[PDB]
Nucleic acid binder design. Structure first.
Lengths: 129, 115, 102, 198, 132
RNA sequence: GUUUGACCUCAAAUCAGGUAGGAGUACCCGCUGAACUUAAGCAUAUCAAUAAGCGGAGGAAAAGAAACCAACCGGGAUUGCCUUAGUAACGGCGAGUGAAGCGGCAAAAGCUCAAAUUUGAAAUCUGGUACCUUCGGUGCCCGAGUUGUAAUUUGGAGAGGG
């Protein structure tokens, strides 16, 4: 479109917009404490601080009955580690648990695809002279 | 009595869902702590072993495939901890077996004064 | 290559290639020449294998993959193993003393 | 209102110390999309186009002692070739002090950066490239360090000082202390005629 | 070295900072400091202090303008978030500092104990005869 | 045709003919692998990619005709000797470890397959068998083999015609 300072033409591309997509090896954090142990905050009424500095309070004061229930019949997506957002145990969604099993028995991860597509002869369609 | 038969469809589902292996546990961590999202695992899901029929095939063939269709993915100690915390049942360490364990170690402490 | 060298001790391991692999086992297809066969002992392109300097080439890593694992090639990168790592170690770790001392 | 992203890339030929510079800058910059390695010039615009990068830090090393940073804006921006002489990394023991990993720095500058439009351009590019956006995803709130930039003997001396509090304020120097000798400025990104020479 | 295209570059690249808040820019320019006033230009002892003075200036100005807005400045000592240098690394530096302090004290007590071995006898007999 | 016949794969036979093991082991090619010691007590390190153990070869073995070195006014397979040189580089930058190109010299040597149709003709080979001028040759027969044996071609190109 336009040119350089000396004799040559340049291609003006539109500006690059820094967007955190569906996958960028990083997600919305909202707890903002890194690879530190959650041994800290076990004596606090909050789990860390976030951007623009305010107190991320611990969400609930559960019963002793429910805590004993979750150490006999463990929750559905129970993972044994502690969440960063809150001191409560990080569970897994039904869809993720389905996805782990479908890796281990190999069972077709990306759906809406055919395992057995007809061989579309993209090259033999046209005969050679 | 319909829910008596409809809830069991979830109760049997969450047995084919729950984590059993260290190899599944690591990937559950890699999800839980933000290292890999859904989109990353859907990429990794396409293996050397994808696009394989399993329902039509005779059992004497699948029982030799499934033994040898395990991709050795890297593990952590962090995952092995939780999977040992998941399998440990109720009667694993009662008062009886604790007292018996001390009854063993007292006998050992006696046997080293027998010399 | 070594296992097929022992089960078929009359033959000589020429080369081997990959055929199929698995979680537990990697498969290969070794290729073997009969040096005692008269169709090999004539024809001057293959009778080099009958020379007794090729008795078990696979046991001494003289095959393609053995020469790879020994690290035998050319250059800066293979200086520690170009004439063989045992040979070069023994050579460079030798106090060489002359009649008229250098 | 300010929304930017940096691409941290390397070349084959980068040694121990220079690898530690890519480590520590990826630490200090919360908007640093850290990338492993590149082998070859024209590709770097396209890498930036994939990750929606507003900036590209290309660390080159021709002879293995040297370092040449190619700071740039990807689509049509003026790229700047440096030669970084002195180096003292993050993991040098004489420096004492913890900055927060990727908190908002405060950019310090000099009088002589406004002397020419030449030094004015590097001043601006150091503001938004070496700086920070107000809402970067890995960025920590409470401000904890600075970025000292100053020119003496035609070269810009870069330091990162953690501010120290007592109960008014001190500041102990840490991090990558290095000079930047402005070698070359291209017209477009890694292409076109050269504007500035030494 | 044409400054024309350089100004054209300043047209495209720049974002209006004066037309917005300080928070979007956050860059206190230490103008009125050329940093050419330094004596011993290749000795880097006065230069360290001069750079320190410049840094401290920009900190104070940024403290004022950021206090003008309703955005906090100080680390509250209530968030224990991830830091640049690791804890084991900080234990290495602190280890080194306590090592050098203990070595300095070792040489101070070295002078002390040597003096005690040299004049210990005279200490005994002087204190005893003074007691008598 | 509910029969007969091609193949494919897998067997057996005191079948015909062969071949492998064990010894020696200085040197040579691999695999496997310590410790005493030395470093200041000492998880690195060092002795040491050593000794012991295990396999495999010959008169030599191995290596070897560049996915080599360089930065020149460019050299040109390997191996060995003098030199590089205690140099470059490694290392609580500690004890210590530690090359290579160049230059000189010893000795020198180059080649061969796979991948492009012999398709106007499997031109190839092993065995059995009868003779002969017998480390073999010739005749006939059973086979191997087109899922490829022969001739041509290997980058220094090369091939088909004139």
């Amino acid at each position: 479109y336009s040119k350089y300072a000396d004799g040559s033409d340049r291609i003006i591309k539109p500006e690059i917009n820094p967007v955190y997509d569906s996958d960028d090896s990083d997600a919305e954090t909202q707890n903002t404490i890194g690879n530190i142990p959650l041994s800290a905050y076990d004596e606090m009424p909050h789990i860390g601080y976030d951007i623009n500095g305010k107190r991320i309070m611990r969400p609930a004061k559960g019963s002793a009955l429910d805590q004993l229930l979750d150490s006999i019949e463990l929750p559905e997506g129970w993972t044994g580690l502690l969440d960063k957002n809150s001191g409560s145990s990080l569970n897994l969604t039904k869809e993720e648990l389905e996805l782990i099993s479908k890796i281990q028995r190999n069972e077709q991860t990306d759906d809406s695809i055919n395992p057995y597509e007809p061989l579309i002869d993209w090259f033999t369609r046209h005969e050679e002279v | 009595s319909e829910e008596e038969k409809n809830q069991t469809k979830k109760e049997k589902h969450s047995r084919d869902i729950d984590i059993a292996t260290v190899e599944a546990m690591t990937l559950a961590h890699q999800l839980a702590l933000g290292q890999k999202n859904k989109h990353d695992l859907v990429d990794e899901g396409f293996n050397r072993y994808t696009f394989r029929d399993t329902e039509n095939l005779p059992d004497w063939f699948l029982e030799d495939e499934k033994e040898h269709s395990k991709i050795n993915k890297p593990i952590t100690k962090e995952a092995a901890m939780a999977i040992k915390e998941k399998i440990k049942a109720m009667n694993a360490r009662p008062i009886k077996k604790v007292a018996e364990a001390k009854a063993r170690k007292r006998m050992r402490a006696v046997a080293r004064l027998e010399k | 290559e070594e296992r097929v060298g022992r089960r078929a001790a009359n033959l000589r391991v020429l080369n081997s290639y990959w055929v199929n692999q698995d979680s537990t086992y990697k498969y290969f297809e070794v290729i073997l020449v009969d040096p005692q066969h008269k169709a090999i002992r004539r024809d001057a392109r293959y009778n080099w294998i009958c020379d007794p300097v090729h008795k078990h080439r696979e046991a001494r890593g003289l095959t393609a993959t053995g020469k790879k694992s020994r690290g035998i090639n050319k250059g800066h990168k293979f200086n520690n193993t170009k004439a063989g790592r045992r040979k070069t170690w023994k050579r460079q770790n030798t106090l060489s003393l002359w009649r008229y001392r250098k | 209102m300010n929304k930017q992203r940096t691409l941290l890339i390397s070349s084959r030929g980068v040694n121990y110390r220079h690898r530690h510079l890519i480590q520590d800058l990826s630490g200090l910059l919360p908007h640093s999309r850290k990338e492993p390695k590149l082998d070859t010039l024209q590709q770097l615009n396209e890498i930036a186009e994939l990750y929606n990068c507003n900036n590209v830090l290309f660390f080159e090393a021709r002879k293995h002692q040297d370092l040449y940073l190619w700071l740039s804006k990807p689509p049509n921006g003026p790229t700047i070739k440096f030669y970084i002489q002195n180096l003292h990394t993050m993991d040098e023991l004489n420096f004492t002090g913890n900055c927060l990993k990727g908190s908002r720095p405060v950019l310090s500058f000099d009088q002589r950066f406004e002397s020419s439009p030449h030094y004015q351009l590097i001043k601006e590019l150091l503001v938004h490239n070496f700086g920070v956006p107000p809402n970067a995803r890995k960025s920590k709130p409470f401000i904890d360090h600075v970025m000292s930039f100053s020119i003496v003997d035609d070269k810009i001396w870069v330091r990162t000082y953690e501010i120290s509090h007592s109960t008014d304020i001190s500041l102990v120097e840490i991090g990558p202390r290095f000079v930047m000798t402005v070698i070359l400025i291209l017209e477009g990104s890694f292409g076109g005629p050269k504007i500035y020479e030494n | 070295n044409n400054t024309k295209a350089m100004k054209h570059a300043l047209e495209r690249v720049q974002l209006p900072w004066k037309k917005h808040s300080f928070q979007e820019h956050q860059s206190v320019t230490s103008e009125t400091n050329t940093d050419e006033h330094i004596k011993d230009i290749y000795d880097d002892t006065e230069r360290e202090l001069a750079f320190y003075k410049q840094s401290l200036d920009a900190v104070l100005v940024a403290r004022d303008e950021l206090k003008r807005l309703k955005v906090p400045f100080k680390r509250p000592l209530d968030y224990f978030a991830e830091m640049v240098k690791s804890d084991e690394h900080m234990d290495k530096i602190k280890g080194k500092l306590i090592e050098e302090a203990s070595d300095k004290k070792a040489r101070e007590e070295a002078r002390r104990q040597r003096q005690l071995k040299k004049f210990g006898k005279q200490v005994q007999n002087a204190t005893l005869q003074k007691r008598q």
